[PDB]
Structure formats: C-alpha cells, structure tokens
Design a protein around this ligand. Structure first.
Ligand SMILES: [Mg+2]
Ligand SMILES: [Mg+2]
Ligand SMILES: [Mg+2]
Lengths: 306, 306, 306
C-alpha cells in the first residue's frame, strides 16, 4: 500500500463552486484564476485534490484548456488523486446519458493525472425546499426510482469495464435516499454489480448527520469497509433528546464528531483498505476543516503503519 | 489598508469582567493586577486588545490612573485598537445621558492609544429571566423603544461629529431586538444616520445563535459589509429539527461554526472593508477561543492579501 | 505543589477497552500488544496514564505479569499517576465485595508505580436500554439504593484507611444518579465520610452533558473544588431550546465546551487544589481529544503558575 506520507489525502474542490470571481463560469476563467484557488489549498498543506465536477469541469474542457489546467495544477504544487462526480447521476431522468458520457470522459482523463478513482453516486439536484433549509439534509429531496435500479447496475458495470481497462477503479458514493443509502443496501448493490473494478465509497458522514434513526457508525463501517475502494471522510456531532424526539447534528473536524475515526481508520486498514482519501466538508469553513482533517488522517496513519 | 501582519485583531476584554481577584472593583486594583490579566492575553499571541467598558473603566479613571494603565499595557506588549462599550446604551432610560458622556470621553481617549474605533450598541442589561437561562439569548430581554429611535440617531450623529474631529470613527454594533437587530434595519439605520464617520459593526454571530428564523449568513453579511467599519467576529454552530421545531446553537471557533468566515472575510475585503477586527466569544473558554480565532483570521488575511 | 511541567495529566485508558486485537481478553495478551496501545498514547505527548480497571486489569494479573507490564510501561515512556475503577461499585449487589477487594489490591499496587490516587465511584453497568441509545446518558440507568449508603460510607472509610497507610489518597468520582450525583450530595457525602485520605473527584462533565436542569458549572465547581483531591476533566457543549424543552450536548475539547476550564482550573488552584489530572473523553476520538486536552491544561497551568 501507500506509506503514511504518500497516502493520497485529497482536498475536495466542490466548496469553490463553479462561479468565477468576475461573475461568469469558472470553466471560462483564465488559468491564473484557477491557480489562485488551487494556491489556497496548497497553502493549507495539501499535496492532492479531487476537482469534483462542481468546480472546473474537466470533462467539458477542450484538450488545450486541459493542458492549461495541467500546467497551473503542477505550478501550484498539487496533483489529482481522485475525481468525484457530485449531483450528476447516471440515471438522472433528464441528464443520465450525458452524465454517463461525462463519467467515461473522466475515466479517460484520470490516468493522465495519476488519479486512481473516479467516483459516482446517485444523489441528484437539491430540491427548492431543500435549498430553503438551514441544511439541505433537514428535508428529504430526491429519492431513487426503484424501476431504474437495473439500469443503474448496467451503467455502473459499463463504467467499471472502462475503469478496469484504464488501470483504475470506479467508486460508488453512499448517500441517503439512494440505491446505496443504507449499509445493507450498499452491500447488496455492490454484490449485485459483481465487478472487480467497482467498490464502495463509505461516506457515512452523509448518514450520521441525518435526523433519523441510524446504527452506530462502528457497526455501519464494519459492514461496508470490506467492499470499499475510496473514502469521502467527514464527521458531524450527533445528538438526540428522547423526551422531545429532537435530533441534532453539526459538521465538525474528524477529531471532534460522533464517529471515532482513529478506531475506524485503523479498522479499515485491518480490513485491507488501500484506496485514497478525500476530505469533504459541506458547510462551515469547508476548506479550513478539510485541511485540519488531512493532518489528522496523516497522524492516525503514521501511528497505524509505523 | 493594513497588511495581514499589521491588521489589528484585538482580544475583547469583557470576559475578565470588572471584579478584582481580591473581591473589589477592578477600577481600584493595583496596576500589577491589570498587568497579570493583560499578560494572559499576550501569552496567547495577541498584539491588540479592546478593553470594552466592562473591565477597567477607562472613562472613569483619573488621568494619573490612565497613565498607570498605559504603562502596564505597554509593559505587557499590547496596544488598544478599538474600545467597545457593552450594555451601555446612549438611550438607556436611566443612564443614557451618562453613557453618552462616557462615549465622548472614550472618543477623546482613543487616539492617545492609537485606537481607530469607538463602538456603541443598543443592547442593555440582561433581565433577571435572561440571567437564569443556560444562555442569555434563549429568552428575549430588552427590546428598543420605537419612540427613542430619533433620539438614538441624534446621539449617534453627535458622537460621529466628535469621532470625525478626532480622526477616528464610531461603529454601531448589530444586536438582536434593537434598532439595528436585522440586516435591513441596520442598513436603514446607517442610511438615516447619514454620517461619514459612523459605520456598522456586523456582529452577526449575535443573530446566528438565536432560536428563531434567520437568513443565511452569506446573505446577511453581503447586505451589511458595504457599510461596515469595524467587526466583532465570532461563530456558533446552528441547527434546526423540522419534525420538532427545535433550534440549537453552540459557541465555537470561527473555523467550526455555521458561518464560513474564510468566504466572508474574503468577501469583506472584496467589498472594501478596512476596519480593525475584534475577537469576542461569550461563554466557553472565551479567551482561549478568541486566541485561536486571531490565528485563524491572520491565515485567511495572509492568503487573501498575498 | 507540582510545577506546570511536572503536574501529572494522565491519559485515561478506558477507550482501549479490554479486548485484544486477536479477539481474546487484553489480560492474556503478550506484553508487546500492550506496548503498541501505550505507544499511541506516548505518540500524542502524554507522560502519564491512568490504566483504569477497564483495560489491562492490574488487580487480576499475577505478580510476574505485573512486572511484564511495568517493563513495557517504562519502555514506552509512560508512568501511572492514578488508577480509576470504572463501573465497579463497592456496593454492587453481586460484585461489591469483589470490587472492594480489588480496590484494596489497587491501593497496594499504586505506590509501586508512583501513583498518588485510587479513584472509585458508584456508577454501575450500563443497562440494556442505555446501550441502545445514541449516548448512554440519554436514559437513566442504575440509581443508587438508599439503603446501602451507610455501607458505602463504611467501605469508603476502610479504603481510605488503607490509602492513608500507603501514603496516597482515595478519590470519589461524582456521577449522576449516585450518592454523589449532585454538588450538594457530594459535599454532604464527603463530610459524612470524615476521612483525611478521601476526597472528591469533581467529574462535572458527567452532569453538564445531561438533558436535565443543572446549575451553571461555575457554581457547581465552586462548591466541590474545596473537597477535591483528583480530577477527571472533560467538557461538552450544552444547549436548551425553551420553546420545545429540548436539551442537547456533545463531547468536545476542554477549550470548546460549556465549562470555562481556564476560569475553573484557575479557581481550583486558588482554592488549594493539588491533585493530579486525568483526561477522560467518552465518545468521538477519545484519545485524540484527550491529547489536545492535556496540551490545553499545560498552557493554563503554565500561565497560572508563572
Ligand atoms: Mg461525499
Ligand atoms: Mg459584540
Ligand atoms: Mg470520570
């Protein structure tokens, strides 16, 4: 596997969004604008990023703009270890075929950067009601259509074939209200896919934040880590008040939230986990917390691998 | 403007209160007692303080005691960048005229320390019911009297004239249940004041903590930052449980709470903000969290100004 | 007293539990297994540990296994400053006499390690319903039997006699729903015990986390610190929503929770507190947060003792 100091721990770029400081789309911005965003990430200690598809859209750039991007990525001291598609489901009713095609494009781009994972999930656009809430997860939004599960499996396998040929893997991001929205459902889904270049991304912070019953993360992670090839890793406080029935959660650094990631990262290692990490953190100071989380993971790994 | 390393980031002294370790009033204490309190602040890395009016009452000291204070302030490696009056409203029914007179005294004292802001707000004493709560903001206390708004504007302008003559500015601290207790109300108030030596202090942590509907801080800060000349800067987690209607909040470091202060400080800069900062943090380890917050702001500024 | 840099600040070992990585009991593990657990603690900066009775059971080991343990403790750069029995009440109906005997054994072992405290409390096993909750403290579990208070006092005194003879002291851990589950009850209990080698352990985080009315920690600590000889020191956010009646709490570093431990540690010192500290933190990254808490305490002490 990697050693602690070379294990990729990527900054997820979704917090930058896709608007340029001048008001247009980031896809059209001069490379120097991209460079200043990347610089903020390097300043906080990262070696790796995950550009997502919610920042500079690599699948959409011309080949010459890809090379402009490649130059500033290197100049700013960074590399891409994974590419995570966000709210771009391959079974979106309107855009699923486009999203599938973009996923294939990202599988071809990934090896050129040295990236080893393309990640997809079944989350879709936030609904208007979700956008009004203090956090989007406070109300249910998109719920996967049961009639499209077989299509989802077919398209996952198609992507996995391409990934395998390119020497990389596809990862499937666990997310609420989707085909892979509970530990048992995720396990059954990855077993049904039956593809040696596809694995889970156990982004269980997505579940721990929810105001609904949830098994303890120790139990959930033990189920899904054996099938995991990539890891969006974030934490939340979690609380409940039996007398009222109120739940609460707050995004927090890995060290401070409800999951014990010292125990869980060590468990992952024990279970043979070898995939890259990706620090995500919706809300709060997303980038600043991700940077603390990277340092945290590096200490945990250093101790566990010594 | 300032550079990142010279931008004043003051420790607010209100957490020391006004009781001396021996049991009397801090106003009567030997200068060495003041020195040991100041030393705790310097030990945590600050260059600047804001004494408030809730610690050593500078407006009340004799001139010779002011010089005693000035000596220990320098000896302990600190300087005053702003002076923030607390629960000392210039339209308090009993003490408003005294508070106005004290504000004028502070405007005369400020330049001697190199301070560039005197800050006033419309908060008043906590009520007995507020004092019984886990946090004072859990119940409504003082609510400004509509019949005194014109008097408030008149007295603000009077202070602003004095500030202008002294080469400094007055700032108006946003605080719930006052004339400047919502973004729109604060904007309308500063426009009505119509004075080029008066500005807002967008202490929006005061609002984010409240168990009531509140616009997202991105939206609120965008409205008020164009009018801001000083900044009490603090954060809170913020959560809500739709099924019960319960709200919750907890004081936290800037990096960890609901506001994204990386984005918001950069926005402020983009909007031409140049005033000093003041780290405030009611509850918890107020001084310790303020010290982390200062280091946080310095990193954000360093990156944004590089 | 101690100086800041020699004041013992122990890592509580209960978060390791008593299962060995291979699946058996830690009591049977090779010393090298113990060494790797101890190493994680030293890596995070500790000089001292409190083994508890929930990790390697020192009272149960043979004398030759004690010496095996002693060797790896030294090899890994650590020492024992206190031994805290957990859910091992000396008035447990089934196991009280065994627990009493084990407490005596620990009083004989403690001086050999240089430890100055053996700590006992009246908490008992978590109930099945407690084990199902998001946190055990969300539902009431064991409640002490009033008819056994006199027996408890008798057995405390018996332990205190032994402690005194051995040049150490017994501490009594405050914990909800026990004889010492409120400040007033703890004070009355320690006064009734009337023993100069017994004192309180004011683990008031145990109370601050609870979803019930609670006096402010300033008030509670002022009552119990005069009687305290040892200190399990942890923090929680604490919040309440009057409109719904919902409470919430989350384990957090000392610096970030509801108690102001800068003020409270300084108060302790003022009140003559001289006992060792023990960093405990149930849930979250227990060890990682304890390590930050140790650094925190060392800064507070350094400033207060300078
Ligand atoms: Mg994710
Ligand atoms: Mg303020
Ligand atoms: Mg304890």
């Amino acid at each position: 596997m990697y050693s602690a100091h070379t294990w990729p721990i990527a900054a997820n770029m979704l917090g930058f969004g896709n608007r340029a400081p001048d008001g247009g789309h980031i896809k059209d911005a001069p490379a120097g604008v991209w460079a200043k965003q990347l610089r903020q990430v390097r300043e906080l200690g990262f070696d790796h990023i995950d550009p997502t598809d919610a920042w500079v859209p690599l699948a959409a750039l011309s080949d010459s703009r890809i090379e402009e991007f490649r130059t500033v990525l290197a100049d700013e001291g960074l590399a891409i270890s994974s590419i995570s598609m966000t709210r771009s489901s391959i079974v979106d009713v309107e855009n699923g075929e486009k999203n599938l095609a973009d996923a294939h494009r990202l599988i071809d781009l990934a090896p050129s950067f040295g990236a080893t994972i393309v990640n997809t999930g079944f989350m879709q656009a936030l609904t208007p009601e979700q956008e009004k809430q203090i956090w989007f997860w406070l109300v249910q939004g998109h719920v996967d259509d049961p009639a499209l599960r077989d299509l989802a499996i077919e398209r996952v396998r198609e992507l996995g074939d391409h990934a395998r040929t390119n020497g990389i893997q596809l990862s499937l991001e666990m997310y609420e209200d989707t085909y892979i929205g509970t530990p048992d459902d995720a396990v059954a889904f990855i077993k049904d896919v039956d593809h040696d270049a596809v694995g889970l991304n156990p982004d269980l912070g997505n579940l721990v934040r929810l105001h609904r019953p949830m098994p303890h993360p120790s139990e959930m992670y033990a189920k899904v880590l054996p099938y995991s090839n990539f890891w969006h890793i974030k934490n939340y406080s979690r609380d409940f008040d039996p007398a009222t029935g109120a739940y609460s959660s707050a995004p927090l650094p890995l060290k401070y939230g409800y999951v014990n990631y010292r125990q869980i990262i060590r468990l992952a290692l024990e279970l043979g986990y070898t995939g890259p990490f990706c620090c995500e953190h919706y809300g709060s100071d997303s980038l600043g917390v991700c940077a603390e989380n990277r340092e945290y993971i590096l200490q945990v790994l250093t101790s566990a691998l010594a």
